[PDB]
Design a protein around this ligand. Structure first.
Ligand SMILES: Cc1cc2nc3c(=O)[nH]c(=O)nc-3n(C[C@H](O)[C@H](O)[C@H](O)COP(=O)(O)OP(=O)(O)OC[C@H]3O[C@@H](n4cnc5c(N)ncnc54)[C@H](O)[C@@H]3O)c2cc1C
Length: 295
């Protein structure tokens, strides 16, 4: 039922770049690009929460061909234009390292993607993943805890739930539950998809709550920079109350490291009612209601 491995690394789909647009506004940190690919001429289909592989050109330091890197799909199954013809990614350029020659390290696949030109042919594999799927139940509550590019699967869920053209295309999914996105980024210009996220909250105030953790602009009560874990702590009792509902799903996505703080916050909330969060969470994971993709 769920499409998986329609294309594999030995014989990838060759897609064409339609557009490559910047998501970090002036004054932000780093480069994150929204890249849309043309799927016509192949049979790549996918659903919300899945990933695709991209195989970048070139060889590694040992002269071996570069292998695929996975990227969370950032578009709904219908693509950004709701035409079933495209797929989009949300790609951050990876960079790092200290003063030792050569000092500048640029990630191979992310540099390739973030600098890619419209018209370029790209090797795509997948789709893959069954851990980040959105329930078919339109009355589900959906908690979304994202940092940076971890917004990608959240965009797929939220667009499907709330975009006019999506609602028109999906007669069997008219979302009437409650969704809450807690989104951590360093600056306001780094709020990926800010305008569209805020448009959704304005239009659906009873079905969508938007909470930011902006590290360079906000401080937690302890005086440290504000991170997602701090917002989860701030709203721990509330989030726990929602998690107790049999129909609530929670999604966590982004660079590894935020899970520990999230668990600590929820553990303290649950303990007040005699619940050991780590046990409850194991049961949630087994039930398919606790969804994590960190990298
Ligand atoms: C399921 C999944 C979903 C993903 N979704 C997205 C997404 O939506 N958007 C996105 O941008 N990325 C996403 N990623 C990450 C992506 O797959 C790549 O790993 C990333 O883009 C970097 O690869 P690259 O070739 O640029 O870097 P590569 O050249 O592989 O370089 C990566 C290497 O950098 C080395 N390194 C050394 N020091 C550091 C350091 N301080 N910080 C980081 N690396 C260091 C590590 O050894 C690492 O293996 C996802 C990954 C997974 C597994």
């Amino acid at each position: 039922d769920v499409p998986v491995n329609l294309y594999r690394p030995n014989a990838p789909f060759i897609g064409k770049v339609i557009s490559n647009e910047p998501l970090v506004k002036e004054g932000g940190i780093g480069i994150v690009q929204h890249i849309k690919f043309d799927l016509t001429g192949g049979n790549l289909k996918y659903i919300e929460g899945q990933s695709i592989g991209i195989i970048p050109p070139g060889v590694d330091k040992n002269g071996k061909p570069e292998k695929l890197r996975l990227y969370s799909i950032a578009s709904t199954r219908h693509g950004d234009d709701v035409d079933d013809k495209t797929i989009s990614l949300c790609v951050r350029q990876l960079y790092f390292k200290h003063p030792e020659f050569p000092e500048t390290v640029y990630g191979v696949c992310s540099t390739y993607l973030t600098h890619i030109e419209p018209g370029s042919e790209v090797k795509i594999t997948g789709p893959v993943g069954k851990e980040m799927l959105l329930p078919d139940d339109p009355e589900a509550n959906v908690i979304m805890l994202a940092t940076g590019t971890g917004i990608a699967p959240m965009r797929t869920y939220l667009w499907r739930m709330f975009k006019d053209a999506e609602r028109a295309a999906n007669p069997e999914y008219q979302f009437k539950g409650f969704s809450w996105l807690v989104f951590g980024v360093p600056t306001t210009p780094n709020i990926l998809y800010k305008e569209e996220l805020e448009e959704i909250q304005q239009k659906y105030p009873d079905n969508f709550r938007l909470t930011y953790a902006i590290s360079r602009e906000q401080k937690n009560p302890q005086g440290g920079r504000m991170y997602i874990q701090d917002r989860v702590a701030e709203h721990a009792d509330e989030l726990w109350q929602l998690i107790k509902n049999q129909k609530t799903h929670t999604y966590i996505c982004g660079l590894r490291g935020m899970e520990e703080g999230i668990d600590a916050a929820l553990s303290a909330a649950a303990a007040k009612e005699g619940v050991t969060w780590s046990d409850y969470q194991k049961d949630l994971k087994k039930a398919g209601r606790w969804h994590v993709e960190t990298y």
